[PDB]
Design a protein around this ligand. Structure first.
Ligand SMILES: Nc1ncnc2c1ncn2[C@@H]1O[C@H](COP(=O)(O)OP(=O)(O)OP(O)(O)=S)[C@@H](O)[C@H]1O
Ligand SMILES: Nc1ncnc2c1ncn2[C@@H]1O[C@H](COP(=O)(O)OP(=O)(O)OP(O)(O)=S)[C@@H](O)[C@H]1O
Ligand SMILES: Nc1ncnc2c1ncn2[C@@H]1O[C@H](COP(=O)(O)OP(=O)(O)OP(O)(O)=S)[C@@H](O)[C@H]1O
Ligand SMILES: Nc1ncnc2c1ncn2[C@@H]1O[C@H](COP(=O)(O)OP(=O)(O)OP(O)(O)=S)[C@@H](O)[C@H]1O
Lengths: 620, 82, 248, 81, 85
């Protein structure tokens, strides 16, 4: 009766169809059976990494026994599954847990050869005492069948330490299925999720939810890393087919919130916020327009979806993991053609490099680049102060809308061998081990970032050999043994090699400072030109706009004359320091006079000071 | 944990009167170890500001013991005493 | 607690809450975990979802469900005997399963679920993978990979939700919404030109901490100081008197 | 060159956009990237830069939608699709 | 010979010739999936104390249950090809 008390049946559950179809995996089930019906050592144990299906195999064996598809001495066995948790509970006296275990073991002994004891997380037996060792005598007598299941490493963490036990089990290896077998398992499990929710699931969906969760989610294993996408897409579609679909459930809750803002911001007895209200109204209206249009289109579609297609899976893969793998919904494809003219709002010239940076992004949005390699990795090099670091920051802002969100490391500190452990972690058992790497732990999560190595040639030519397997293979392994993948990042290396030669010295110095197998891995090695006298007026107006935006927190916008701009773009030009002299000149000329005029009264806020050309200086 | 819960309950039962004061609070981190469980049972009550906990530690045992626990440093305001 | 109006208004973060919902309402393995740096708002999301349930904006699969806040600390309080903690946790699990999914257990700081042993926080592993107990957890970014990811058998039963920090434009709105809760506690008024400054200013000076949290402290401290000034004399009239009463 | 183009086709067979390359095209390719100092990687670089660039320029500009086969041919310098 | 690896030898030469595609092709037709090759890179093992990275750390230290990195792959299911990049 103790079996009725503590453990719970499994075949009784199988008889009522409470378990799922167990498509595939016949080889391992046969192996389990022929190990289970052996003379001595009839104790199989399932070993494999988590998620591959190990309780599924015992469920399948249960279905098999109930249907009657087993060899002779396995008819009507009534597989039983222990429960050590409920076994040791409320047994607060000195001889209770071992007594209950005695009763259970005796009841298993009395049944001649029917019961099949089944323990999941087998390793949890090695303790359980304060015991849990009154099983070696029984296993020595073959009385117990003890089909077990654990993972690959808890095995050698809790069992192999007791090799008196590890002898009594025979290991069965359970390797993860391939994409085909995954498609197969999904084609059989589809029916139950179609029933739990109320939607339809095409076969293109059951193909995508396996071929996609294999290229992107490189941390879990197939049979469930591919099911979870389907089981989320179903629930999302249910939500949609209920009250209003998404992308209307955002503009509604956004227009409402903007309204709540504006109907309480207007009653501010101030003038400063009077220009912060002259935009809230504008955007609130411009969004009311869009909500109206979309709600109207809803009527056209309702008069003139109902199944989880192939791209809802992709939407889930994008909501997870952040990587955009969608279908280019007709609004992004305009940005991807205006990419060059949108970068040109922040960088000027170097179009031979802008075209190359940008072309490697549409090339991956159209799904044409190689799938196991970085999304593109190339090195900038040219004279000083030309733009070769502004361009990387302008590209990392066009993609995420915040310049601060790029992983950036300055290679002017990695000057010795041992400072490689600064970005890879520390080998096992040492001081900083719980901290992991520094380049790794920021690309192990959200692997859509942009990686920037400034001044790569300042390093030690042994850091160059981590980027060997970073480039052209896309993965590296930190100290913990984990393998992060760089198959979605955009690596960028800046440098200043040569800086004095036209075009031969730069290449000669590159070939002399790097290895051939390192310059051979990159994409095009771009060269920046150097600014021309014509190309500085377009920087002068940029700098002046930026400065005006700075001193716009006190409503103090400038008013610059065209002779002033021409003088400013003619004074600071020298073609050896790039474009920083212009910045220092703007400061020294304008900001000094402005700061001496500002804190000496006479330029109190809400003013518009003009600047104009005097013979040499330029007075306000 | 029993004693800690008793003290926290009696601090909370008062009408916000008590102002606890832990001197050298860099010892609160690994209060009871065995597996992180103890010393951060007060972490729900710090945020709501139920107990007040003015404490004081030296300048380099604050980044050797606490700053290694960025979730708990968040609940503390630093007053630099030069 | 959310019914009696005891929680702060939650603003924005629509995508996070909708993903929490559409994960919390699947067949098996229906338990999300919020993840992200400390301070960016991860208990705020659960409280927003609770207020949302009380109002009734949630889908049919979640209308009329209660959220219980499990407290692992008060379970190991008195358990010196050899089975009492397991007995307690088993009663709790049986009672959760005894309902028909009308309960959503919410464990805060769930990295503390690994211990409790001395074979504990491990008897939950069966009921997790089947979807009986709906678990909503939230731990910071780097204690995850320190206590959980070490146990890939247990971190398989969790679906991660990343919570990135907001920007300045969004923090401004969050403050615009939260102002009227400090306006009451401190008997003062707060100006919108100050709500913009407490967010632009605290973004170039305090870099050791993350968003909104590092922008609400300024507002709260300013209000508390202003109330102090209101009661007593103003500053720079107080210290001049304190040191004079000492030089004497 | 044949192995590269076969793998490329197998890759962009997920949108059913099979390709059609001519013998003068394959000869132009196998002649272009040959320099005996870097090996074969320049061939993959040239394949990408010369075909995938244009193809992905068009693929998101409409006109090359799924279920299609576009032929390539040698032009004086480049090879127009 | 029955006490020696079933094969162990080196090839070397200029870059972009195939000295890696050859090993990959070898691992592809014995196991039918190229993922089934143990590939470790000797460019990260530039330090002396990184010998315990593929051997494990002694008992009583921090990284102990994690086991090795090369040994723990060949202890379970030894049939692969091991690549020394
Ligand atoms: N062949 C299969 N047929 C049907 N479902 C499967 C199959 N293989 C795996 N699954 C499903 O994938 C998941 C695997 O569950 P389990 O096998 O219990 O986990 P596990 O493989 O035992 O690893 P752990 O350590 O228990 S998490 C379940 O949702 C199964 O239903
Ligand atoms: N083409 C450009 N367009 C706009 N600003 C530019 C341009 N070139 C330089 N600048 C300015 O120069 C500064 C940035 O120069 P950087 O390109 O970052 O210097 P650099 O290219 O990194 O050269 P080094 O060798 O690394 S110092 C900013 O003040 C920019 O405004
Ligand atoms: N979206 C939001 N709307 C309103 N208030 C918010 C929002 N996000 C955060 N807050 C407030 O900012 C603070 C954030 O605190 P919590 O989010 O509870 O702490 P936390 O983000 O969970 O960080 P940890 O990991 O718990 S230490 C609280 O005062 C919240 O009320
Ligand atoms: N004979 C070849 N057979 C097959 N692929 C080749 C051959 N020669 C070059 N390749 C391809 O060209 C690239 C060269 O790959 P690798 O073998 O790694 O280069 P490598 O010869 O190893 O030079 P290093 O020193 O490793 S950079 C791969 O894309 C190969 O597929």
């Amino acid at each position: 009766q103790a079996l009725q008390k503590y453990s719970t049946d499994l075949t009784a559950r199988a008889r009522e169809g409470k378990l799922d179809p167990v498509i595939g995996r016949d080889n391992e089930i046969r192996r389990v059976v022929q190990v289970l019906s052996r003379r001595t050592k009839n104790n199989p144990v399932l070993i494999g990494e988590p998620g591959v299906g190990k309780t599924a195999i015992v469920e399948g064996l249960a279905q098999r026994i109930v249907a009657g598809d087993v060899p002779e001495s396995l008819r009507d066995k009534t597989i039983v599954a222990l429960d050590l948790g409920s076994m040791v509970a409320g047994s607060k006296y000195r001889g209770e847990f071992e007594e209950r275990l005695k009763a259970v073991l005796d009841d298993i002994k009395n049944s001649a050869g029917q019961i099949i004891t089944f323990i999941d997380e087998l390793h949890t037996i090695v303790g359980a005492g304060a015991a849990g060792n009154m099983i070696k005598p029984m296993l020595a007598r073959g009385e117990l069948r003890l089909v077990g299941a654990t993972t690959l490493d808890e095995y050698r963490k809790h069992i192999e330490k007791d090799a008196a036990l590890e002898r009594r089990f025979q290991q069965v290896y359970v390797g993860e299925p391939s994409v085909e077998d995954t498609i197969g398992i999904l084609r059989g499990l589809k029916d139950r999720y179609e029933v739990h929710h109320g939607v339809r699931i095409t076969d293109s969906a059951l193909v995508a939810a396996a071929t996609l969760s294999d290229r992107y989610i490189t941390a879990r294993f197939l049979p469930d890393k591919a099911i979870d996408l389907v089981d989320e897409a179903a629930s999302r579609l249910r939500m949609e087919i209920d009250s209003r679909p998404v992308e209307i459930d955002e503009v509604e809750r956004l227009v409402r919130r903007l309204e709540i803002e504006e109907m309480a911001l207007s009653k501010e007895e101030d003038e400063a916020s009077a220009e912060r209200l002259a935009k809230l109204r504008s955007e609130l209206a411009d969004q009311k327009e869009k909500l109206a249009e979309l709600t109207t289109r809803w009527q056209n579609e309702k008069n003139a979806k109902e199944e989880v297609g192939p791209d809802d899976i992709a939407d889930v893969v994008s909501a997870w993991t952040g990587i955009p793998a969608g279908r280019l919904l007709e609004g992004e494809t305009a940005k991807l053609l205006r990419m060059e003219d949108e970068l040109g709002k922040r960088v000027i010239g170097q179009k031979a490099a802008v075209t190359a940076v940008s072309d490697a992004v549409r090339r991956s949005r159209a799904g044409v680049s190689d799938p196991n390699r970085p999304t593109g990795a190339f090195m900038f090099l040219g004279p000083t102060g030309v733009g070769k670091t502004e361009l990387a920051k302008a590209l990392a802002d066009f993609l995420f809308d915040d310049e601060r969100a790029m992983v950036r490391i300055d290679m002017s500190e990695y000057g010795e061998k041992h400072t490689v452990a600064r970005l890879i972690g520390a080998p096992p058992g040492y001081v900083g081990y719980e901290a992991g790497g520094q380049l790794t732990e920021a690309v192990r999560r959200r692997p859509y970032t942009v990686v920037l190595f400034d001044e790569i040639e300042k390093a030690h030519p042994d850091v160059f050999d981590v980027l060997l397997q970073v480039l052209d293979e896309g993965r590296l392994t930190d100290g913990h043994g984990r393998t992060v993948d760089f198959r979605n990042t955009i690596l960028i290396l800046t440098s200043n090699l040569g800086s004095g030669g036209s075009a031969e010295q730069v290449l000669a110095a590159v070939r002399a400072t790097f290895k051939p197998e390192f310059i051979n891995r990159l994409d095009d090695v771009l060269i920046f030109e150097g600014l021309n006298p014509e190309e500085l007026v377009r920087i002068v107006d940029i700098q002046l706009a930026q400065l005006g935006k700075r001193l716009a927190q006190r409503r103090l916008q400038l008013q610059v004359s065209l002779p002033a701009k021409r003088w400013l773009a003619q004074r600071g030009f020298d073609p050896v320091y790039g474009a920083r002299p212009l910045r220092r000149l703007v400061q020294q000329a304008i900001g000094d006079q402005l700061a001496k005029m500002l804190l000496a009264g006479q330029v109190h806020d809400g003013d518009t000071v003009p600047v104009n050309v005097s013979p040499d200086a330029d007075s306000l | 944990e029993e004693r800690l819960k008793a003290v926290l309950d009696d601090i909370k039962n008062s009408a916000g009167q008590i102002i606890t004061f832990i001197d050298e609070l860099h010892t609160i981190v690994g209060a009871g170890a065995t597996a992180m469980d103890a010393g951060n049972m007060i972490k729900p009550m710090l945020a709501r500001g139920e107990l007040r906990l003015v404490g004081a530690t030296t300048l380099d045992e604050y980044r050797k013991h606490i700053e290694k626990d960025a979730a708990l440093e968040r609940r503390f305001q630093q007053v630099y005493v030069g | 607690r959310a019914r009696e109006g005891k929680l702060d208004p939650v603003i924005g973060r629509d995508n996070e809450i909708r993903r929490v919902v559409q994960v919390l309402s699947r067949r098996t393995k229906n338990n999300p975990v919020l993840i992200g740096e400390p301070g960016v708002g991860k208990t705020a999301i659960v409280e927003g979802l609770a207020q949302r349930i009380v109002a009734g904006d949630v889908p049919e699969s979640l209308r009329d469900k209660t959220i219980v806040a499990l407290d692992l600390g008060s379970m190991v309080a008195g358990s010196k005997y050899r089975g009492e903690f397991e007995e307690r946790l088993k009663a709790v699990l049986d009672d959760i399963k005894n309902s028909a999914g009308q309960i959503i257990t919410f464990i805060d700081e769930l990295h503390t679920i690994v211990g409790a042993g001395a074979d504990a926080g491990n008897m939950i592993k069966p009921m997790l993978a089947r979807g009986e107990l709906r678990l909503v957890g939230a731990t910071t970014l780097d204690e995850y990979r320190k206590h959980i990811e070490k146990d890939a058998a247990l971190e398989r039963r969790f679906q991660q939700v990343y919570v990135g920090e907001p920007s300045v434009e969004d923090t401004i709105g969050i403050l615009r919404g939260l102002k009227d809760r400090y306006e009451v506690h401190h008997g003062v008024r707060i100006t919108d030109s100050a709500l913009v400054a407490a967010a632009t200013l605290s973004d170039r000076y305090i870099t050791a901490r993350f968003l909104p949290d590092k922008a609400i402290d300024l507002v709260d401290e300013a209000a508390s100081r202003l109330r102090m000034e209101i009661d007593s004399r103003p500053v720079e009239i107080d210290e001049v008197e304190r040191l004079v009463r000492r030089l004497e």
